[PDB]
Design a protein around this ligand. Structure first.
Ligand code: UMP
Ligand code: UMP
Lengths: 316, 316
């Protein structure tokens, strides 16, 4: 079926993936360099071998698409994918008066009581970002997250470039352009970032009237990351095609360091014994065409019928 | 043999490569998305199925390595790879008093006399850049060529970053870093460039004590470009390893738009009937270690024994 390339990457890593020490304190089995591709005319590459929440994907993408850097948008749609990053800022600031929270991610993963204290504090934070406009403005704003690199690349003139909106125009005028690239990697900022963009750079290509996208990920966590990463960019490819009145082609996923955290081995294995089902089908709103103005209800997933979810530890 | 991956890309493009209109006015057969890899412990991937001038590769690389943007360095080593770009600037400037030269590349490819006039003017230019220090400084300096993007990324503070020297330090301190990336793609400059960098971005990786590099090329001309592109980055990988006291691993070559100009079909075909020979062997100077201070005589190619050269039209 459609998702086989994923399953083959997992198998691949389990076999010849070498043990390499990673930034976190968990180990990894990894390979360097891998291309994988999905034919979007065959369906949406949302894994059926485990329930992946399409909502977190759909709302996070619109977030980037709006050039939004404030977590407040995510939280209103019950998306806490980025909470961790806002919170850490809030914690080491002068206005924080409460439990230590140092190394919170590790400490919570290691202490029962702490985790509960953590969720009380993070619960407080999420309420402040939601209601206190000044708080949201001072702590919910991440600054350098995708939607900013995509839609507001700050120039040396202090100006700002809409990389994405710009390339979409070139796609409509010079479809045969071999430079329809959007990059999220800025050398001046990357050395002072908690996490440089994993999704370094992507490229569009148009031939025979159908759109294609190739993403370059410098670091991927197979079991947890990739299932989300694939759906995000396959979805981007759809929306861009919708806008450009083009047909959908292929999503090519190139990798740098593709890895599997050792604390995920049993889970990946169990998944590897499941039989892919017929991939779901995506439906974008026919009437709406400005994908920058698209909202939740304009993107639908039909016939998604996956296997139960596989819970697994997040590495630290 | 070693170069089979190249030959397979060529075969691949000839078979399912679709005809796509390109920027120039020649046509192309192309594919979007391709990974190819070479095991540098097996030898240097300099094609034996046709004589590729290692010198133009070796001297151009040192050029980039020195953060040099002035063509004057190339010309002293009889390298005219970049002349075309300096010259065009010189031509449309106030100080140019001579034959029209408009569209010179095409006009020369189309007129016998013109071509001779062209080579007289370009001969003049090359002598001025070589001897007139102010001329060299005003016309030989390209400004935004690789060695600048690599070793002097201009920041928004007007400052300058040595991307390359910086990553080499991280390789020596955090070998297991999944962010050892050097990028040559700057969104603010790319929309005002004759040719945005084809060699968009590369990534290093270290495991089991041996270095690896993966290059991402957004546009490749199989017959003419790639044979040079491969040797350039395989060589970079060697020098970086030499510096870091590491072993050499693999060169992974990912592609965006890989193409074959139709005016190269007979030539590629003829090459495809040749039988690869044993790949040559590279030797870097054992005593010298600062690769930024390396010069010609510190890099040697042993046992290179290729088939005759294949002359073919440059597309325009
Ligand atoms: O969408 C994403 C975002 C992150 N990661 C992972 C990759 C690594 O596991 C970690 C980033 O590690 P570093 O390369 O920064 O060290 O986060 C993914 O797999 N997918
Ligand atoms: O080292 C190089 C440099 C350039 N090119 C080619 C790729 C294309 O043939 C042309 C650049 O075309 P655009 O993508 O800019 O349109 O130059 C190569 O193959 N190898």
């Amino acid at each position: 079926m459609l998702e086989q390339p994923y399953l083959d990457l997992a198998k691949k890593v389990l076999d010849e993936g070498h043990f390499k020490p990673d930034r976190t304190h968990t180990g990894t089995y990894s390979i360097f360099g891998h291309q994988m591709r999905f034919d979007l005319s065959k369906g949406f590459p949302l894994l059926t071998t485990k329930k992946v929440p399409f909502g977190l994907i759909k709302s996070e993408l619109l977030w980037f698409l709006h050039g939004d850097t404030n977590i407040r948008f995510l939280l209103q749609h019950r998306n806490h994918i980025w909470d961790e990053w806002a919170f850490e800022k809030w914690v080491k600031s002068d206005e924080y008066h409460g439990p230590d929270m140092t190394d919170f991610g590790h400490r919570s993963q290691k202490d029962p009581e702490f985790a509960a204290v953590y969720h009380e504090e993070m619960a407080k934070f999420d309420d402040r970002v939601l209601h206190d406009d000044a708080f949201a403005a001072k702590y919910g704003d991440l600054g350098l997250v995708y939607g900013s690199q995509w839609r507001a690349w700050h120039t040396s003139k202090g100006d700002t470039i809409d990389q994405l909106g710009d390339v979409i125009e070139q796609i409509k005028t010079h479809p045969y352009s071999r430079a329809l690239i959007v990059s999220a990697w800025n050398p001046e900022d990357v050395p002072t970032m908690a996490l440089p963009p994993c999704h370094t750079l992507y490229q569009f290509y148009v031939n025979d009237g159908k759109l294609s996208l190739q993403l370059y990920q410098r670091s991927a966590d197979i079991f947890l990351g990739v299932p989300f990463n694939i759906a995000s960019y396959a979805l981007l490819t759809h929306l861009v095609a919708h806008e450009c009145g083009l047909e959908v082609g292929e999503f090519i996923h190139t990798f740098g360091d593709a890895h599997l955290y050792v604390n995920h081995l049993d889970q990946i294995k169990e998944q590897l014994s499941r039989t892919p089902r017929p991939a779901p089908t995506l439906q974008l709103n026919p009437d709406k065409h400005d994908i920058f103005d698209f909202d939740m209800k304009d993107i639908k997933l039909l016939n998604y019928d996956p296997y139960p979810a596989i819970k697994a530890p997040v590495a630290v």
